Amino acid sequence: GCGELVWVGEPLTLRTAETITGKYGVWMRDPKPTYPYTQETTWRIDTVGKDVRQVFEYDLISQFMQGYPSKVHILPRPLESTGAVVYSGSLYFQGAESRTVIRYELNTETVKAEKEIPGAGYHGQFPYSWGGYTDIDLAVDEAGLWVIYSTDEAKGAIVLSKLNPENLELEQTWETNIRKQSVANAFIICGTLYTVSSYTSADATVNFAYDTGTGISKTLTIPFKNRYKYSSMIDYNPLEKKLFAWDNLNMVTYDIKLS
Ligand SMILES: [Ca+2]
Ligand code: NA
């Protein structure tokens, strides 16, 4: 069932990167797995550097946690930052030094669609507060695929658009009043965008909400712990109903509760 976020659990570390290449990154599972993948399949991208192309794929959670990848994909174009997601068999990622979102079908290693996010800032215009070229952040929730960004028209306030997952068309767009550069990251649960106050503090909070169904913005004070003091990626997985994050080399997951 769906509801408002009311609680976040303690971060649990599932894997720790062993080199500086993985100081920041993105790891994820597919909330709508398709053959040959399952809900155990995990993908990991270590995103430090300027030619990020390697995507580590693990058939089993045990392999993700303790072993080597079962497959490495080499993306056909370098990827930007930590905002990518996997949805219904495709990796959705942002091309380096662009506002282009790319749909890369994992089982065939084929680019199926590319879309400029209209008006979106990129490459350090509207990052989250830590920087990292985090201008464009994809998200999956119970209703499918979204993108979080900003524009000059929005004066840097978070904008979110629902995306067609097949062709990347924008279906609907909402504008919040939350300065994107003022929050550490964001994610969407049940159609509500939530933000995190700090990427360094052990005593951060989920501090704002914007409900796309009602247009209402709220403040919140839900505790959120950055166990390792540098969270570069915070996303929601609607199948597991958990937050997935990357915090200073560590791939972590948080339980949640909804009303
Ligand atoms: Ca996010
Ligand atoms: Na994302």
Numbering used by the authors: 244 to 502
Provide the publication's sentences verbatim.
Among the common features associated with pathogenic myocilin misfolding, we demonstrate that a single metric, OLF thermal stability, can robustly segregate benign from early-onset disease variants.
At the outset of our study, five variants could be confidently predicted as benign polymorphisms: T293K, T353I, K398R, A445V and K500R. Modestly lower levels than WT were detected for T293K, E352K, K398R, N420Y and A427T.
